[PDB]
Design a protein around this ligand. Structure first.
Ligand SMILES: O=C(c1ccccc1O)c1c(-c2ccc(O)cc2)sc2cc(O)ccc12
Ligand SMILES: O=C(c1ccccc1O)c1c(-c2ccc(O)cc2)sc2cc(O)ccc12
Lengths: 155, 154
């Protein structure tokens, strides 16, 4: 029963995506338990143009400790979960917001729009990726954002 | 209800595929894939606000500009995602081409993109594209700031 197996996987995986997106506060310290042992998470949109990937359930648990310090009240909001034709692949559109307490920068407030990709293997997350506009993180840190000159562009 | 949803999803998928494969002079007619009041544009920009192109007529005018400033643009590595909403699709892809912006040196622009497509009565009501603007800055020779990482776990 291929269809029955796919339906069951999609239903379970959706529950894991929901749980991930609703994980807040001290529960963030256990969010890595939603991943496979070799699971990868992280931020795919950065100033360098390369992802910052956090590799392995153990490193993901270590990152959570840092995350609670530097984003102490972070929440995802406006959460819209998208199932796909692949029962093991979901997308989420949402916003996120919270204080940002990055080392060596003034404390700030960070808001952004996010897309998340979740790929599953055997009931847990194998790959999580988040995509945002880094310009908004720059603004939250007081970093000057470059501006494309629009004089010559239609408007 | 289910027959209607299946029919919508199958037709809408063909439109997404056509959009993503549209290149060259055919870009001048891509706006015909939209409703009269359809919206398209770039949701990730330096200002933090979208640059939305409102209405099928304005979309057709934007295509003319697009063919001048992105004269050979191609979408590659296209992955189309249907969803539980037969009228909502997402696409993960890359894009590449020359960038010829007014008052900047000619460059080569490459980026990773996500696209959202929402449909109404067989045509695109809302198209949005999401990318990392730092790569467009680099293509234009604009300096990209660097978040200092010394204090961050490595
Ligand atoms: O915000 C993050 C981040 C990274 C990965 C996962 C979640 C995040 O929020 C970040 C960096 C970072 C690197 C190492 C580390 O241990 C903690 C954070 S560097 C950097 C540069 C940018 O332009 C924009 C964001 C960032
Ligand atoms: O590239 C675009 C663009 C905008 C909308 C749809 C497709 C696009 O590719 C663009 C701008 C633009 C504005 C008016 C116009 O008529 C033509 C282009 S300004 C700007 C500033 C940024 O930081 C990054 C990108 C851009």
């Amino acid at each position: 029963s291929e269809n029955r197996a796919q339906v069951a996987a999609r239903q379970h995986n959706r529950k894991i995506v929901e749980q991930y997106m609703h994980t807040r506060g001290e529960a963030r310290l256990k969010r890595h338990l939603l991943f496979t042992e070799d699971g990868v998470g992280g931020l795919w949109t950065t100033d360098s143009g390369q992802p910052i990937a956090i590799r392995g359930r153990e490193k993901l648990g270590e990152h959570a400790v840092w995350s609670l310090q530097c984003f102490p009240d972070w929440v995802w909001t406006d959460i819209q979960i998208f199932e796909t034709q692949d029962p093991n692949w979901f997308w989420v559109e949402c916003r996120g917001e919270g204080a940002i307490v990055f080392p060596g920068y003034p404390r700030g407030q960070y808001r952004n729009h996010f897309l998340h990709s979740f790929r599953f293997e055997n009931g847990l997350i194998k790959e999580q990726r988040e995509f945002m506009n880094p310009c908004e993180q720059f603004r939250s840190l007081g970093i000057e954002v470059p501006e494309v000159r629009r004089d010559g562009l239609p408007s």
